[PDB]
Design an enzyme around this catalytic site. Structure first.
Site, PDB file in Angstrom:
ATOM      1  N   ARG A  51       0.721  -1.135  -0.020  1.00 40.32           N
ATOM      2  CA  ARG A  51       0.232  -0.077  -0.222  1.00 40.32           C
ATOM      3  C   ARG A  51       1.013   1.095   0.131  1.00 40.32           C
ATOM      4  O   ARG A  51       0.582   2.246  -0.759  1.00 40.32           O
ATOM      5  CB  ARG A  51      -1.159   0.065   1.321  1.00 40.32           C
ATOM      6  N   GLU A  69     -19.877 -20.269 -17.352  1.00 41.97           N
ATOM      7  CA  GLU A  69     -19.295 -19.889 -18.829  1.00 41.97           C
ATOM      8  C   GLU A  69     -20.303 -20.273 -19.837  1.00 41.97           C
ATOM      9  O   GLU A  69     -20.687 -19.445 -21.011  1.00 41.97           O
ATOM     10  CB  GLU A  69     -18.034 -20.186 -19.201  1.00 41.97           C
ATOM     11  N   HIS A 108      -9.811  -2.650 -10.518  1.00 41.26           N
ATOM     12  CA  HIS A 108     -10.623  -2.059 -11.238  1.00 41.26           C
ATOM     13  C   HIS A 108     -10.267  -0.503 -11.226  1.00 41.26           C
ATOM     14  O   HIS A 108     -10.800   0.079 -12.081  1.00 41.26           O
ATOM     15  CB  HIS A 108     -11.964  -2.594 -10.702  1.00 41.26           C
TER      16      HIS A 108
END
Ligand SMILES: *[C@@H]1O[C@H](CO)[C@@H](O)[C@H](O)[C@H]1NC(C)=O
Ligand SMILES: *[C@@H]1O[C@H](CO)[C@@H](O)[C@H](O)[C@H]1NC(C)=O
Ligand SMILES: *[C@@H]1O[C@H](CO)[C@@H](O)[C@H](O)[C@H]1NC(C)=O
Ligand SMILES: *[C@@H]1O[C@H](CO)[C@@H](O)[C@H](O)[C@H]1NC(C)=O
Ligand SMILES: *[C@@H]1O[C@H](CO)[C@@H](O)[C@H](O)[C@H]1NC(C)=O
Ligand SMILES: *[C@@H]1O[C@H](CO)[C@@H](O)[C@H](O)[C@H]1NC(C)=O
Ligand SMILES: *[C@@H]1O[C@H](CO)[C@@H](O)[C@H](O)[C@H]1NC(C)=O
Lengths: 595, 201
Positions: free
Chosen positions: A151, A357, A487
């Site tokens: 971090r 899937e 993301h």
């Protein structure tokens, strides 16, 4: 002669030349992904370039049609999808700097190496090693060292990058007639022009709040139970009245809690439902696994696989000489071509992923009759939700007894249901407050509600206030602790996981009442039920042509997000957690009493 | 009597290359013996949709002239070569009358008409100002005007080239694989009908 017929002819030309500059792009990306060679790299680059340039020039030619004189809703929707500027609305210098920033975020995240001080002869990368040290280690100070070091380095090497990134994206969104970049991302759920089904960009956050207010009690009980089990793991370091330490959540960021199943097991004496030994003793190869998934999907009433699916899909790792990406991916190449790229191992987890899937492939197959620009999910949650419902239904003991994986002498008592539901809760309910916290923090930092020098104090307070997780040490604005996630660092919307999680259990309840299931929701199977398959295929056939509110009313008979299916799914786990949380204290305090 | 002089169905069916659907080939068949039993008995010829005459009694009824229209379309538009249907093929490329006396034959040709790079030698017309008359062939390449300003032959804004290409690849679904279609039209005229089937001894 009118404007609408001009728009229709332009859209026909656009739809043709695009089904082709895509199938050429998707075929080249497929040839790169199954065969990592530099000529495949340059083929993917030239086709991606010709596809991005094609959409650039077609949006330039598409913005000559104003939308206020078009009354047909499908043509208006296709032109609204086509006329989106993207990054082209800026000047060329700012767009080039933004693409440089995005590329260097990708290279920093991909090549971020963090290792032990005083041992520099080799160092350890995040995806190979930091995931393993976060998921497997039981040492408090070792996880603290890895957490604080990663971090610290990523925050110091990404904070000014995000400082410029938020400004460039805010200018892009305010140039696109959006309030902020958060408004641009919430615009995916916006529905305008349809009477009764109208949905605004601003309502979703309070809708999320209305769902999260009922999410919060169930998670609290799970948190208390996890805290009790962490009391077994860490005796003195975690406080009983305080929140969880951040580097103890089993992942690098706390997104998933599924690595805590060994520590937080309800009933460790009971066996699990792992069926890998039955597959390996009878030599169940991957081809017949996909044949069994196809048999399940034709049992529910959906159409079976194409012949080119079986011919062209690569369901096995090819070998050492040919290198391929091991990520399970369903590919819709266009022109009726559907493939799955998956390096299958003979395990139950790969069995469930194959069901997932193939649910993805069925969802892509159903809206093939739509026009090209409407060939998507009705929102970003539905496409993954319709695969996660198949992963839910295939994991039931009834389906495994039906297909011979589970023995007919298996006893299904309530204890294995409780521990299965706790595994599913650690996977599903644990990620909801982290996702809502991260998206609401990002929405306020794009809106400017959070001041620039108050980010970390606000962010950790959110993690304290929403997720109930306290930082180990205070962090000042030299750090960027949000940016350590995949993301957010690579410009991805994050609320899709929250909406997928709610729509998953909503769809599960809708199919189980369609299939006339007379018990609790987690023991329900939609197999051998044609009416449930027809009810699902009524939604799968629409694609993006209709509003997502109308598709939701078509499935669940409701036009708005509901959390009642999620708490109804976890009802016996909720009563069990209420039973065994009598001695512990439910809820948390905002003080830093744990650490 | 002893029969010879078979109709030249081998040059129509077993040709190496078929024409595009916009420029569909028409071959007239006259003064020969037409053995339709070969076409019914071939299993690769999957679709034998015959309209206005029964396929069992095709070998006895004799006709004056036989028109063999041959072209290549995709899988999804095979159903549009029929009376009363609409679409791009029916409106703009090949139109069948409602009182159509004759059969249609279609079969998959993915092994022949598809290339890995992609086949671009086959074209269809996408935009026409008016719907076509029955059995009319339009091979014009004039620019289609969808707007108000004149095109003047330049394919700019609101001016499109009316002919696109079917990019056949061996990896397409069944609805996009190339289908070779031959339409046999049987006509009777005041002239003595000289196209008849064989007679059994
Ligand atoms: C993968 O690429 C290599 C190098 O171009 C080639 O030799 C090999 O045949 C390819 N594999 C397949 C299955 O096409
Ligand atoms: C919009 O146009 C399509 C043609 O692609 C047509 O089928 C549809 O009926 C039109 N919508 C309305 C509401 O008329
Ligand atoms: C796209 O950007 C151009 C250039 O500023 C602008 O004229 C146009 O209105 C924009 N379109 C949309 C839909 O924002
Ligand atoms: C799918 O099912 C149909 C009949 O339901 C059958 O004709 C077809 O061969 C099947 N396809 C495959 C690949 O098994
Ligand atoms: C399971 O059922 C038995 C008998 O009904 C009961 O004694 C036990 O407490 C139950 N346990 C759980 C976890 O539901
Ligand atoms: C569904 O049908 C198949 C074939 O009829 C059968 O083998 C299977 O057991 C059925 N599923 C269940 C859950 O009974
Ligand atoms: C074309 O070739 C096939 C090959 O089997 C043959 O049977 C047939 O008689 C030939 N002619 C026609 C008109 O099909």
């Amino acid at each position: 002669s009118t404007i609408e017929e001009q728009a229709k002819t332009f859209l026909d030309k656009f739809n043709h030349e695009a089904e082709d500059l895509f199938y050429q792009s998707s075929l080249a990306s497929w040839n790169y992904n199954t065969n990592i060679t530099e000529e495949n790299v340059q083929n993917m680059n030239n086709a991606g370039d010709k596809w991005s340039a094609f959409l650039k020039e077609q949006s330039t030619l598409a913005q000559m049609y104003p939308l206020q004189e078009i009354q047909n809703l499908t043509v208006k929707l296709q032109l609204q999808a086509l006329q989106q500027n993207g990054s082209s609305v800026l000047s060329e210098d700012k767009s080039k700097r933004l693409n440089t920033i995005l590329n260097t975020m990708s290279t920093i995240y991909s090549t971020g190496k963090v290792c032990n001080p005083d041992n520099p002869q080799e160092c350890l990368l995040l995806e190979p090693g930091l995931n393993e040290i976060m998921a497997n280690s039981l040492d408090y100070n070792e996880r603290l060292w890895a957490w604080e070091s990663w971090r610290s380095e990523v925050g110091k090497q990404l904070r000014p990058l995000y400082e410029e990134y938020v400004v460039l994206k805010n200018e892009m969104a305010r140039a696109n007639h959006y309030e902020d970049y958060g408004d641009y991302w919430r615009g995916d759920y916006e529905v305008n022009g349809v009477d009764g089904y109208d949905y605004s960009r601003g309502q979703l956050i309070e809708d999320v709040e209305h769902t999260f207010e009922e999410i919060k009690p169930l998670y609290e009980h799970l948190h208390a139970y996890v805290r009790a089990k962490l009391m077994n793991a860490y005796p003195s370091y975690i406080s009983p009245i305080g929140c969880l330490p951040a580097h103890l959540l089993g992942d690098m960021w706390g997104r998933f809690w599924t690595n805590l199943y060994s520590l937080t097991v309800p009933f460790g004496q009971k066996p699990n439902i792992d069926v890998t030994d039955a597959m390996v003793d009878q030599a169940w190869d991957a081809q017949r696994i996909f044949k069994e998934a196809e048999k399940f999907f034709v049992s529910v009433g959906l159409p079976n696989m194409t012949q080119g699916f079986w011919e062209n899909s690569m369901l096995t790792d090819p070998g050492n000489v040919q290198k391929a990406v091991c990520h399970p991916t369903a590919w819709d190449l266009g022109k009726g071509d559907f493939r799955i790229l998956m390096c299958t191992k003979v395990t139950m987890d790969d069995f469930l992923t194959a069901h997932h899937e193939m649910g993805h492939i069925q969802y892509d197959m159903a809206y093939a009759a739509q026009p090209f620009l409407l060939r998507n999910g009705a929102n970003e949650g539905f496409h993954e939700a319709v695969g996660e419902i198949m992963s839910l239904s295939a994991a039931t003991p009834k389906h495994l007894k039906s297909i011979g994986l589970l023995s007919p002498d298996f006893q299904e008592d309530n204890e294995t249901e409780i521990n299965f539901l706790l595994k599913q809760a650690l996977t599903i309910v644990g990620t909801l407050p982290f996702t809502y916290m991260l998206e609401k923090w990002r929405w306020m930092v794009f809106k400017g509600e959070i001041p620039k020098d108050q980010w970390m104090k606000k962010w950790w307070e959110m993690k304290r206030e929403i997720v109930g997780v306290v930082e180990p040490v205070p962090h000042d604005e030299t750090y960027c602790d949000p940016a350590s996630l995949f993301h957010v660092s690579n410009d991805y919307s994050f609320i899709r996981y929250y909406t997928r999680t709610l729509y998953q259990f909503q769809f599960q309840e809708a199919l189980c009442q369609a299939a006339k299931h007379e018990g609790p929701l987690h023991k329900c199977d939609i197999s051998n039920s044609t009416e449930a398959g027809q009810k699902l295929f009524n939604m799968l056939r629409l694609g993006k042509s209709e509003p997502w509110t109308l598709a939701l009313e078509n499935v669940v008979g409701a036009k708005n997000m509901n959390v009642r299916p999620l708490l109804n799914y976890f009802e016996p786990l909720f009563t069990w957690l209420k039973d065994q949380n009598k001695n512990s204290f439910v809820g948390w305090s905002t003080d830093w009493s744990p650490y | 009597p002893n029969i010879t002089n078979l109709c030249p169905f081998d040059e129509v069916f077993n040709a190496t290359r078929f024409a595009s659907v916009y420029a569909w080939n028409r071959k007239r068949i006259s003064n020969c013996v037409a053995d339709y039993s070969v076409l019914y008995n071939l299993a690769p010829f999957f679709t034998f949709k015959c309209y206005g005459v029964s396929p069992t009694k095709l070998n006895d009824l004799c006709f004056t002239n036989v028109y063999a229209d041959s072209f290549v379309i995709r899988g999804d538009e095979v159903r549009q070569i029929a009376p009363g249907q609409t679409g791009n093929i029916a409106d703009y490329n090949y139109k069948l009358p409602d009182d159509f006396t004759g059969c249609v034959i279609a079969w998959n040709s993915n092994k022949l008409d598809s290339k890995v790079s992609g086949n671009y030698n086959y074209l269809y017309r996408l935009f026409r100002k008016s719907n076509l008359k029955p059995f009319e062939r339009d091979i014009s390449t004039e620019i289609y005007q969808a707007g108000n300003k004149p095109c003047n032959g330049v394919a700019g804004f609101n001016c499109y080239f009316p002919l696109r290409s079917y990019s056949f690849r061996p990896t397409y679904g069944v609805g996009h694989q190339p289908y070779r279609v031959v339409v046999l039209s049987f006509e009777l005229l005041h002239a003595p009908a000289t196209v008849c089937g064989p007679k059994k001894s």
